[PDB]
């Protein structure tokens, strides 16, 4: 169930308003229906009043105000391990080559602390 709604779209910067008890943390990943494709948004700043400010990981064109936003509670997660070898992927870990789905065994968050 989507819980947030878009309130501003200024270029790549997208603002989304969430219920006050469900505001996503920083660096979390959101997704929205940009027509016929899912568009992922990365949370950058938590503004007051439940409004969050995000950077769109894709083309921002075609976004309407009021679109529903699904709050994935984990940061951007990518497949890892031996399955990735010989494969071309974008920042989101989706295959860019036409060689089909990656036989992932794990997905790891990209934002982690240093040793």
């Amino acid at each position: 169930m989507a819980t947030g709604k878009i309130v501003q779209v200024i270029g790549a910067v997208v603002d989304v308003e969430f219920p006050q008890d469900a505001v996503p943390r920083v660096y979390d990943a959101l997704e929205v229906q940009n027509g016929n494709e899912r568009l992922v948004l990365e949370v950058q700043q938590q503004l007051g009043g439940g409004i969050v400010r995000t950077i769109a990981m894709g083309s921002s064109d075609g976004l309407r105000r009021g679109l529903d936003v699904k709050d994935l509670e984990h940061p951007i997660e990518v497949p890892v391990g031996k399955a990735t070898l010989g494969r071309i992927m974008n920042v989101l870990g989706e295959p860019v080559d036409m060689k089909g789905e990656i036989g992932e065994e794990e997905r790891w968050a990209i934002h982690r602390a240093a040793p």
Binding site: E17, Q20, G48, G49, G50
Partner: protein, 173 residues
Amino acid sequence: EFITVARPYAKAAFDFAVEHQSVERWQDMLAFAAEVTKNEQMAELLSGALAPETLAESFIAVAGEQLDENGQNLIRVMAENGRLNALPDVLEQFIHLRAVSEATAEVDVISAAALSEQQLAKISAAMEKRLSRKVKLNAKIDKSVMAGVIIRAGDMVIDGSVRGRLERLADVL
């Protein structure tokens, strides 16, 4: 200060009250809305960064003497922009616009001692022709002026006090 931001809300509210011939009720509602804003716990609530709709719905809860169809709309409109603190100034500008619409002017009179009714009558009669509006005088005689009288309407001031003459004379130095 909220003087500049209060103006559109006061003007809209006054025009609406004029179109519905309910100005007095609106003035009372505005006074009530201005009083709840001064509440100590409500002040902290208004200072906090609550969502506009939740803050609005919490504000409507503390008011049961508001005309909901119009007063709730007013409050929700101010809430959506965070202007709720401007209510004490919206009230004052509403009163000012009402007085302008009714062509009525308040005048303050200051003198060394209480005036006679005939002097007050002549003052009111002169001021009504000066302003071309009806006037309502109030007397606020003062301990410091030892003679003369001061007449203030709007911000135009006529000074005949002896204190003013004494200072204006020393200025020729």
